[PDB]
Amino acid sequence: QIKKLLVANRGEIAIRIFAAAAELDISTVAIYSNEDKSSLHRYKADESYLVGSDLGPAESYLNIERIIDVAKQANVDAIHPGYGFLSENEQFARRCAEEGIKFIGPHLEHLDMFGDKVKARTTAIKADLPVIPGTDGPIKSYELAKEFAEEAGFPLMIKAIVREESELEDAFHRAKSEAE
Amino acid sequence: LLEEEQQGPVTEQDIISYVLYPKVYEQYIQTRNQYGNLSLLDTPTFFFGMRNGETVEIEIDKGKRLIIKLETISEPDENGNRTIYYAMNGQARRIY
Amino acid sequence: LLEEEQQGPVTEQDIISYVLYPKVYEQYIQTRNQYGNLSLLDTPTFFFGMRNGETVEIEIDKGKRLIIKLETISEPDENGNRTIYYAMNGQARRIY
Amino acid sequence: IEVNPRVQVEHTITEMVTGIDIVKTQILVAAGADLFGEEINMPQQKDITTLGYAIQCRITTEDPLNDFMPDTGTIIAYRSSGGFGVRLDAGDGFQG
Amino acid sequence: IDNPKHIEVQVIGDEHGNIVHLFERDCSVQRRHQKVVEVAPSVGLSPTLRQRICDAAIQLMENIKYVNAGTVEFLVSGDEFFFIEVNPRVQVEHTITEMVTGIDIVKTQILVAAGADLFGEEINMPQQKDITTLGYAIQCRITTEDPLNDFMPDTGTIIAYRSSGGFGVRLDAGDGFQGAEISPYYDSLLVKLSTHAISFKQAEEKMVRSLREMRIRGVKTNIPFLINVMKNKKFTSGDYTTKFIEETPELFDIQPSLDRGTKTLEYIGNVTING
Numbered sequence: 001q002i003k004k005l006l007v008a009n010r011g012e013i014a015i016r017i018f019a020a021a022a023e024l025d026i027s028t029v030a031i032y033s034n035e036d037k038s039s040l041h042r043y044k045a046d047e048s049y050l051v052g053s054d055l056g057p058a059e060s061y062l063n064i065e066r067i068i069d070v071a072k073q074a075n076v077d078a079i080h081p082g083y084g085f086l087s088e089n090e091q092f093a094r095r096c097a098e099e100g101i102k103f104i105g106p107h108l109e110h111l112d113m114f115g116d117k118v119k120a121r122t123t124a125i126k127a128d129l130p131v132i133p134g135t136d137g138p139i140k141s142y143e144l145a146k147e148f149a150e151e152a153g154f155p156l157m158i159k160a161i162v163r164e165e166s167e168l169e170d171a172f173h174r175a176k177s178e179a180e
Numbered sequence: 181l182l183e184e185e186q187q188g189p190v191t192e193q194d195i196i197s198y199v200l201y202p203k204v205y206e207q208y209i210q211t212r213n214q215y216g217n218l219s220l221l222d223t224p225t226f227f228f229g230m231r232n233g234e235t236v237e238i239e240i241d242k243g244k245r246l247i248i249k250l251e252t253i254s255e256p257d258e259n260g261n262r263t264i265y266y267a268m269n270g271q272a273r274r275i276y
Numbered sequence: 277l278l279e280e281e282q283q284g285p286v287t288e289q290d291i292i293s294y295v296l297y298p299k300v301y302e303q304y305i306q307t308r309n310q311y312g313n314l315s316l317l318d319t320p321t322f323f324f325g326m327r328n329g330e331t332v333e334i335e336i337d338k339g340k341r342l343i344i345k346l347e348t349i350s351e352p353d354e355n356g357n358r359t360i361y362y363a364m365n366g367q368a369r370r371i372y
Numbered sequence: 373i374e375v376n377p378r379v380q381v382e383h384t385i386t387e388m389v390t391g392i393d394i395v396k397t398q399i400l401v402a403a404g405a406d407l408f409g410e411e412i413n414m415p416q417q418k419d420i421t422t423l424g425y426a427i428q429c430r431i432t433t434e435d436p437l438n439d440f441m442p443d444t445g446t447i448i449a450y451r452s453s454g455g456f457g458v459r460l461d462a463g464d465g466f467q468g
Numbered sequence: 469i470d471n472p473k474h475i476e477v478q479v480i481g482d483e484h485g486n487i488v489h490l491f492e493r494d495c496s497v498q499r500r501h502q503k504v505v506e507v508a509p510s511v512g513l514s515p516t517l518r519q520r521i522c523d524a525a526i527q528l529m530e531n532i533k534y535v536n537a538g539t540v541e542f543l544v545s546g547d548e549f550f551f552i553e554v555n556p557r558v559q560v561e562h563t564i565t566e567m568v569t570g571i572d573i574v575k576t577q578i579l580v581a582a583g584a585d586l587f588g589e590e591i592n593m594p595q596q597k598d599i600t601t602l603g604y605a606i607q608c609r610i611t612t613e614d615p616l617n618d619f620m621p622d623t624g625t626i627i628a629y630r631s632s633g634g635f636g637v638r639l640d641a642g643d644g645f646q647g648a649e650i651s652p653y654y655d656s657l658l659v660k661l662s663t664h665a666i667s668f669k670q671a672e673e674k675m676v677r678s679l680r681e682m683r684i685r686g687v688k689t690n691i692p693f694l695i696n697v698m699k700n701k702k703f704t705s706g707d708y709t710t711k712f713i714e715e716t717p718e719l720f721d722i723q724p725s726l727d728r729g730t731k732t733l734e735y736i737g738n739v740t741i742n743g
């Protein structure tokens with residue numbers, strides 16, 4: 001299936017994947033920024049392609065469409081995104097399969113379930129798993145805050161640490177301040 | 181004759197080439213042996229080399245643009261060989 | 277006072293030395309931070325640096341003796357900073 | 373707490389204690405190999421086990437005496453370790 | 469003997485009468501008298517032959533009360549095995565027994581000379597009936613012996629150097645680095661490559677990937693030969709004799725890794741200095 005593989009990343013994981021790719025006799029392609037022209041990873045692969053002379057250092061590894069450009073002209077099969085850039089981007093994972101490019105990772109919906117801070121928590125409770133008790137969303141009333149404290153028990157971490165109840169008052173207002 | 185000389189496959193282009201210019205075709209083969217394909221070098225670099233402090237890029241293969249920099253040249257050693265300090269693809273290479 | 281300009285611990289020798297020579301000591305410890313235990317280089321190296329192509333051994337410490345070869349020195353670049361190409365214990369090192 | 377749908381930077385240590393190539397498998401899953409077919413050839417969950425303990429250190433230019441601000445500049449010397457028990461994953465560090 | 473299989477066995481003694489064996493290793497892949505590839509343990513060996521050979525080692529090594537690390541060498545033909553010599557020291561390929569059994573061979577030497585019992589707390593050698601092998605290790609010694617000139621050692625300056633690594637690759641550092649001038653006075657070894665896996669074929673695939681990922685310019689090198697020896701079906705079969713290089717012609721042939729990155733540098737250098 002996978003005859004050529006493109007790594008939408010740089011540095012250690014690109015080398016990590018190239019070594020893994022060229023162990024199954026998979027042809028490897030790398031992308032790089034203008035700042036990574038001297039990078040060590042862009043000649044651990046068979047060929048290497050600039051993202052485009054008009055992109056800064058972070059743009060080069062986040063431009064979904066030009067990354068797709070370089071891969072399509074590389075007539076590549078799969079894409080491994082590595083970690084930390086477009087590794088879990090459903091939009092990249094959607095754009096890839098749109099172009100017959102096997103996105104090496106989870107299925108599209110998985111990226112969605114585990115992409116946000118609350119959606120992942122929800123699927124976790126559905127599978128009979130313990131979860132850190134929290135407010136259903138954000139709250140702007142002490143009354144709902146005391147509603148959660150006499151239902152979750154202390155300590156409690158407010159953000160946007162409280163052990164004794166005499167602190168849940170003066171702390172819940174402090175965060176509402178700085179968050180505001 | 182030619183297949184054994186290069187110990188490899190040979191196109192008809194090679195064959196007529198050697199038939200028309202023998203001592204010349206073979207001389208070019210020695211040069212592709214030594215330095216590779218020079219036609220891919222830009223004309224100024226091909227004629228004058230590189231000047232101290234010059235960064236230069238040469239595409240040698242598909243997606244294989246190698247970035248070269250000449251840093252300095254040494255005084256010639258006891259025999260007559262100088263040391264050249266390059267910076268190929270961000271890593272340092274020396275050659276005599 | 278001396279425990280403040282330095283990193284903390286100061287010996288009595290430092291204290292009596294400062295009071296005898298104020299600026300000489302303040303200058304001494306500054307050079308101490310720059311170049312190490314300068315008194316360990318041989319006199320010819322301490323006074324003249326190194327000639328091109330020369331190897332020299334510096335008994336940095338008991339059994340610790342590093343073998344330094346100066347390969348070449350470059351032209352100055354803009355801002356007047358040369359590059360020095362060293363061979364230190366077999367490996368290669370560049371100095372500005 | 374959370375779930376990251378991607379391979380992780382600390383994956384190296386899980387490969388050494390268990391014995392399975394995590395990134396390799398990742399490729400052959402998109403290639404549609406059966407998790408217990410010839411390609412992936414995974415041992416059954418009962419027969420998955422760990423031998424020993426592994427530790428990982430990401431070496432970075434974060435100054436631990438300056439609020440872990442990533443120092444930058446030119447590495448002018450680089451030596452890597454190895455031997456029985458050591459695994460290296462090359463990143464941005466090299467001689468120049 | 470006729471068409472056999474060179475097999476060593478690694479024993480380890482202490483200064484109190486306790487000796488253990490970390491099983492065998494195959495070194496049948498030899499060109500001349502020197503060994504070029506060694507696998508631990510042997511793939512083509514029956515669990516019955518392996519045991520009789522290991523027990524033969526323990527018999528000899530305990531009858532004379534051998535102390536510290538050692539090796540007993542055996543040739544193997546059919547069901548019959550015989551004894552040749554003993555090397556009372558570390559071998560170059562101890563790394564692969566270290567990889568598949570888990571015991572640090574060189575370290576155990578140091579504590580044995582100190583006097584630590586084999587089954588003490590500092591060594592904590594497993595009891596013999598608990599020692600085992602997990603997977604298959606292969607060791608390559610990357611040298612400067614021209615595989616196309618009777619393996620004559622090339623001498624010169626390495627101008628570029630790059631080691632591999634990652635999961636399953638263990639390197640032991642020799643004279644190989646950027647700027648080394650390989651002296652003609654010693655064995656011309658640059659770096660010890662040694663892999664491992666859960667199969668002997670995953671280790672082959674891992675070994676060639678690292679042999680390829682290797683980068684050593686400025687000198688000749690026996691990597692392409694070692695690459696052929698790996699990729700040959702006669703090797704991955706698990707059974708090969710001392711008559712393996714001799715029997716296999718396609719190993720010596722090597723396509724020359726065109727040094728495009730260097731040849732370019734060499735040309736520009738000439739026309740810059742010589743016009």
Ligand SMILES: CC(C)(COP(=O)(O)OP(=O)(O)OC[C@H]1O[C@@H](n2cnc3c(N)ncnc32)[C@H](O)[C@@H]1OP(=O)(O)O)[C@@H](O)C(=O)NCCC(=O)NCCS
Nearest residue numbers: 022042043044045046047048244245680681725726728729
């Ligand atoms: C065959 C191969 C291994 C190089 O072998 P060769 O025939 O000796 O070399 P080439 O003529 O292809 O390349 C020479 C130069 O190309 C350049 N180069 C190679 N791959 C490159 C890339 N992806 N991007 C930019 N430059 C590259 C380097 O400067 C290399 O110089 P060095 O190899 O002397 O340091 C090649 O397939 C390759 O791309 N190698 C680099 C990647 C690698 O090592 N892969 C091994 C598996 S991890």
